[PDB]
């Protein structure tokens, strides 16, 4: 019913991605998110970013 | 503290419900801001606005 955690999958630069929901904005309206491709992590304006699919962690 | 992801359909403010499974792949269930209603939208349909961090 409930889920204990989320991923919240995305898609930035034509690449899949999660919102990391633990790191505060670097300004208003961003983002950190993370790449699934190489796990690596960085800013994005959210205007840009696609919201895919919420699943459980 | 849990994380709170705010969103917009049809131009009003809203959040993602973090603990609901949605019922289908790429869906999602929302809540508006202004009423409190719960509703089932197509994520493709929502823009990510900002997140209140966790």
Known sequence: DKL?????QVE???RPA?????RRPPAEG????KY????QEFE?????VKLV???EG
């Open 4 to 8: 204990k955690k989320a991923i919240v």
């Open 30 to 33: 961003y983002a950190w998110l």
């Open 36 to 39: 699934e491709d190489d796990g």
């Open 44 to 48: 994005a304006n959210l205007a840009d």
């Open 53 to 55: 699919a919420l699943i």
């Open 18 to 22: 999660r919102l990391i929901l633990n």
């Open 12 to 14: 930035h630069d034509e």
